[PDB]
Amino acid sequence: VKKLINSQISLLIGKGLHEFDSLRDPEVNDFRTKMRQFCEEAAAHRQQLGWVEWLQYSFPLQLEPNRALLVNVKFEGSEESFTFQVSTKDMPLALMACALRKKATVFRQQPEEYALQVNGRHEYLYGNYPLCHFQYICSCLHSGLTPHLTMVHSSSILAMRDEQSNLWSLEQPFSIELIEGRKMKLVVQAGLFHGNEMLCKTVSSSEVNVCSEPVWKQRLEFDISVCDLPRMARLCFALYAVVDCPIAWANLMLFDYKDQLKTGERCLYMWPSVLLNPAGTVRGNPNTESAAALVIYLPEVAPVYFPALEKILELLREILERELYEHEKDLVWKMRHEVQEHFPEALARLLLVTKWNKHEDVAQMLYLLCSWPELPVLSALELLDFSFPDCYVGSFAIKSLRKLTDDELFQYLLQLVQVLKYESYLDCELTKFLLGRALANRKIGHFLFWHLRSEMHVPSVALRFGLIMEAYCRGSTHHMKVLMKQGEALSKLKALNDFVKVSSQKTTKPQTKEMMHMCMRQETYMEALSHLQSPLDPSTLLEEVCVEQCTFMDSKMKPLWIMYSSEEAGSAGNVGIIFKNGDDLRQDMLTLQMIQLMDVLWKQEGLDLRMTPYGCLPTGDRTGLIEVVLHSDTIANIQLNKSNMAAAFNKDALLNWLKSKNPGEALDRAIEEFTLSCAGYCVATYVLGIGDRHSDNIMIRESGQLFHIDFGHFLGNFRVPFILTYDFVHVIQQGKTNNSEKFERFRGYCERAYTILRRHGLLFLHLFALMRAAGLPELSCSKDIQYLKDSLALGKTEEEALKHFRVKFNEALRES
Ligand SMILES: C[C@H](Nc1ncnc(N)c1C#Cc1cn[nH]c1)c1nc2cccc(Cl)c2c(=O)n1-c1ccccc1
Incomplete structure (x- = not known):
C-alpha cells in the first residue's frame, strides 16, 4: 500500500x-x-478543518481588485431551476436566502449552511463581499450573461473533505590543495565568493599541458583568515586553456549543511561552458560518466563547527x-x-x-x-x-x-x-x-x-x-490523483502531436486532421483526454472532449487545438486548450504574467483597460499549454479583406468587421473596448520591450478587446519604442479622418497607464531581479534590466518622465 x-x-x-x-x-x-x-x-x-475552511482550501475565491442582474439557481439532487433578480450589491447569502424560499414554496414548506458552486466549475461563491466584487460575476455582467449557480450544502462540502483521506581561534590563511582532473595549456581560476562579490582575491594556478587527465597537487593559497569565512561563502572553481577557451566550472559550500566546516577531500563533477561563475549551483553534475571531475583537498584544523x-x-x-x-x-x-x-x-x-x-x-x-x-x-x-x-x-x-x-x-x-x-x-x-x-x-x-x-x-x-x-x-495524496490525471492527458497529447507532426509531413491538412480524430477516438485517448482539471486553471473543468472541433495549426511545431464541453456547465463549459511542443514556453509565461500584473495595478487605481489575461503554462521540456480565447481572430486574417462578407479600402476591414460583430448600438461599446485594450497593450508592449508585433500575432475579440500572442521577443532584444498602427488608430477614431476627441481620450488612457506603472516601477524591477535565476536567454545580463529602467524612466521626475513619454508617443502617430 x-x-x-x-x-x-x-x-x-x-x-x-x-x-x-x-x-x-x-x-x-x-x-x-x-x-x-x-x-x-x-x-x-x-x-479536520471546518466546512467553510475546507471550501477556502480547495476552492479559494476569485475576486476583482446599483443595477440589476439575472441568476438561474439549481440544487444538487435535481434539475429544477429558478431565476432571480438581485442587484450587484447584495451578499452571496441574499441570493441563498431568496433561493430557499422559492423552494420552500414549491416543496410546500437556513442560508448559512450553504455555498454557491459556480456551475460546471470548481469555483464557489461565499462571504463578506458584494456580488460584483466577484471575478465571475463582474464578467458575466459585461458579457451580460446569466450566472448559473448551485446551492451546495455544508453536508456536501464535508463529504469531499472526507474523500481526501490521506570556531574563531583559527587565524591562519585559508587554502586548498588542488590534486587531479579528468577532461595548449591548462589554467584553474578560483575565487572565494559570498553572494555576488568575492571575499578573498582572485587565485589562478600552476600551468599544465592539455595533456589531461592532468595532475596539479599545487597547494593553492587564499588571501583570508579562517576565523573569518562567513557561514555561507561558496568556493568557486573554473577550468580553461590557452598558450582563452572556457571549458567547465564547479561550485561548493565550504560548510556541511549540518553546519561544520568542510574537510578534507572530495570530488567535483563539473558543469561546462558557453567565465567564473558564483551563481551556478553548489551540487555537482549527475552526468558522472561523461563529466570532467576535479579533485581538491580541504585541509584539517584539529572538527570545527560554526558557532x-x-x-x-x-x-x-x-x-x-x-x-x-x-x-x-x-x-x-x-x-x-x-x-x-x-x-x-x-x-x-x-x-x-x-x-x-x-x-x-x-x-x-x-x-x-x-x-x-x-x-x-x-x-x-x-x-x-x-x-x-x-x-x-x-x-x-x-x-x-x-x-x-x-x-x-x-x-x-x-x-x-x-x-x-x-x-x-x-x-x-x-x-x-x-x-x-x-x-x-x-x-x-x-x-x-x-x-x-x-x-x-x-x-x-x-x-x-x-x-x-x-x-x-x-x-x-488525493491531489496527487488529480495531477496524475493531468500528466496523463499531457502524455497522450504529446503522442498525438508527434503523430500530427509526422503525418502532416506526407499528407494534406484534411487527411491528417481526419486521421488525428481517429487517433483521439481510441478508447485510451478518450479516457486520458477527458474529465480532468485544467493545468492552466484548476477551477476550469475539462470534461467531455469534442473531437470534431479539435484541429492543428498548419505551422512549424504544429500546435494542437483541443475543445471541450461540459453539459452541466453549459456554454461556460465549452472551452479549449492549445498544446504546443517544440518551443520553450517560459518567455511568454513571464510576459503574460507581467501583463497581468499591469492589469492588477491599473485596476487597483480604478483604471480598467479591459485587458485579456489568458493562461500560459509550461509543463515540461519545450512543452506546455496555452488557454483558448474563443471568438477571436487575428488582425492578419481580418485584414486579408476577403470576398464573402457583407470593404472599399483595406483601412476599413477591421472596423467593418467590428460592425458586423456588433450591430446597432453595440458598436459604441466595442470601439471603446477596442480603445482601452489597445491602450493597455501599447503601453504593455512599450514598457516590456515586446518586439516584432505584426498583424499575425495580435488578435481581436468580437467584443472589441484586442490582445497579443507569441511573445518570443523581450526587453528590446532583436531599443524598442512606441508603436501606434494606423488601422487601430482608424478604429479608435470611429471611422473619421479627424476625430481628435476620440484620439486624445486614447492618448490619456496611455498616459495614465504609463504613470501608474511607474509608481510600481520598483515592484517590476525587484521581480525581474529574481527571474534572472530562470536562465531565460533574453533575461540574464545586468543591463537587460536597465531596459526596464529606461522604459519606466524611473530616475526622472513624474512631470519630467511623462515629458519624454510624450515625445515617444507623438513620434508614433507620425508613422501613420
Ligand atoms: C493564433 C491563434 N492563437 C490563439 N487563439 C486563441 N486563444 C489563444 N490563447 C491563442 C494563443 C496563443 C499563443 C501562441 N503562442 N503564445 C501564445 C491560434 N492558435 C492556434 C494554435 C494551435 C492550433 C490552432 Cl488550429 C490555432 C488557431 O487556429 N489559432 C487561431 C488563428 C486565427 C483565429 C482563431 C484562432
Whole structure:
C-alpha cells in the first residue's frame, strides 16, 4: 500500500523515487524525513478543518481588485431551476436566502449552511463581499450573461473533505590543495565568493599541458583568515586553456549543511561552458560518466563547527537613499544603529556595505538583524535577491513574507520558485514556506507543482524539484490523483502531436486532421483526454472532449487545438486548450504574467483597460499549454479583406468587421473596448520591450478587446519604442479622418497607464531581479534590466518622465 504510492509518486514527478535512496546522501535523507512529516501533519490539520475552511482550501475565491442582474439557481439532487433578480450589491447569502424560499414554496414548506458552486466549475461563491466584487460575476455582467449557480450544502462540502483521506581561534590563511582532473595549456581560476562579490582575491594556478587527465597537487593559497569565512561563502572553481577557451566550472559550500566546516577531500563533477561563475549551483553534475571531475583537498584544523549564536550576540548624509563612492560606505556602516532606529526600510543598502570577509562586522550586522522591525513585502522581495545569500536575512525575508495574501503569493510564485535555484542547501526556509502555503491552499498547490514538474529535465534542479514534489505528495495524496490525471492527458497529447507532426509531413491538412480524430477516438485517448482539471486553471473543468472541433495549426511545431464541453456547465463549459511542443514556453509565461500584473495595478487605481489575461503554462521540456480565447481572430486574417462578407479600402476591414460583430448600438461599446485594450497593450508592449508585433500575432475579440500572442521577443532584444498602427488608430477614431476627441481620450488612457506603472516601477524591477535565476536567454545580463529602467524612466521626475513619454508617443502617430 505504501508501495503503490511511492510508485505513483515516481510516475508523477518524472523521476523514480529509488534514485533518491540510491544516492546515500545524508542531506537528502533528512530533507526527505524532516519534510515528509511537516507535510503529513499539514495534511493532518487539513482533514479536520471546518466546512467553510475546507471550501477556502480547495476552492479559494476569485475576486476583482446599483443595477440589476439575472441568476438561474439549481440544487444538487435535481434539475429544477429558478431565476432571480438581485442587484450587484447584495451578499452571496441574499441570493441563498431568496433561493430557499422559492423552494420552500414549491416543496410546500437556513442560508448559512450553504455555498454557491459556480456551475460546471470548481469555483464557489461565499462571504463578506458584494456580488460584483466577484471575478465571475463582474464578467458575466459585461458579457451580460446569466450566472448559473448551485446551492451546495455544508453536508456536501464535508463529504469531499472526507474523500481526501490521506570556531574563531583559527587565524591562519585559508587554502586548498588542488590534486587531479579528468577532461595548449591548462589554467584553474578560483575565487572565494559570498553572494555576488568575492571575499578573498582572485587565485589562478600552476600551468599544465592539455595533456589531461592532468595532475596539479599545487597547494593553492587564499588571501583570508579562517576565523573569518562567513557561514555561507561558496568556493568557486573554473577550468580553461590557452598558450582563452572556457571549458567547465564547479561550485561548493565550504560548510556541511549540518553546519561544520568542510574537510578534507572530495570530488567535483563539473558543469561546462558557453567565465567564473558564483551563481551556478553548489551540487555537482549527475552526468558522472561523461563529466570532467576535479579533485581538491580541504585541509584539517584539529572538527570545527560554526558557532551558534548567543555567541555572535557577542557584539546630514541622507542625500542617500531609494552604487556608491564608498567614502560613503563609511557613514552608512558608521551610523548603522539608527539606520535601524530611524530608517528601517534601508536594511538592504546596509548589508551591501557590511564586510563579509571579516566576522566582526558580520556578527555586528546580524546583531541589528534580529531586532529589526519586519519589512514590507516589496522590501522582502529585495532581500531574496542572490546578493543576500545569508540564511538569516533569508529567514528575515521569509519572516517579513508571511504577511502575503494567497493572492499576491500566486502573483509572485514564478519568481519565488526561480529563487529556489540560488539556495545553497536543500532544507531551507523558503522551501518550508512554499510547501507550507501550497499545502494550505490548493490553487497555490497546483501551480507550485507545475512550476517544478516543468523543470525536471534540467539536471541542475531535477533533484531539488523532485525532492519537494515528493514531499507535497506525501501531504496531499488525493491531489496527487488529480495531477496524475493531468500528466496523463499531457502524455497522450504529446503522442498525438508527434503523430500530427509526422503525418502532416506526407499528407494534406484534411487527411491528417481526419486521421488525428481517429487517433483521439481510441478508447485510451478518450479516457486520458477527458474529465480532468485544467493545468492552466484548476477551477476550469475539462470534461467531455469534442473531437470534431479539435484541429492543428498548419505551422512549424504544429500546435494542437483541443475543445471541450461540459453539459452541466453549459456554454461556460465549452472551452479549449492549445498544446504546443517544440518551443520553450517560459518567455511568454513571464510576459503574460507581467501583463497581468499591469492589469492588477491599473485596476487597483480604478483604471480598467479591459485587458485579456489568458493562461500560459509550461509543463515540461519545450512543452506546455496555452488557454483558448474563443471568438477571436487575428488582425492578419481580418485584414486579408476577403470576398464573402457583407470593404472599399483595406483601412476599413477591421472596423467593418467590428460592425458586423456588433450591430446597432453595440458598436459604441466595442470601439471603446477596442480603445482601452489597445491602450493597455501599447503601453504593455512599450514598457516590456515586446518586439516584432505584426498583424499575425495580435488578435481581436468580437467584443472589441484586442490582445497579443507569441511573445518570443523581450526587453528590446532583436531599443524598442512606441508603436501606434494606423488601422487601430482608424478604429479608435470611429471611422473619421479627424476625430481628435476620440484620439486624445486614447492618448490619456496611455498616459495614465504609463504613470501608474511607474509608481510600481520598483515592484517590476525587484521581480525581474529574481527571474534572472530562470536562465531565460533574453533575461540574464545586468543591463537587460536597465531596459526596464529606461522604459519606466524611473530616475526622472513624474512631470519630467511623462515629458519624454510624450515625445515617444507623438513620434508614433507620425508613422501613420
Ligand atoms: C493564433 C491563434 N492563437 C490563439 N487563439 C486563441 N486563444 C489563444 N490563447 C491563442 C494563443 C496563443 C499563443 C501562441 N503562442 N503564445 C501564445 C491560434 N492558435 C492556434 C494554435 C494551435 C492550433 C490552432 Cl488550429 C490555432 C488557431 O487556429 N489559432 C487561431 C488563428 C486565427 C483565429 C482563431 C484562432
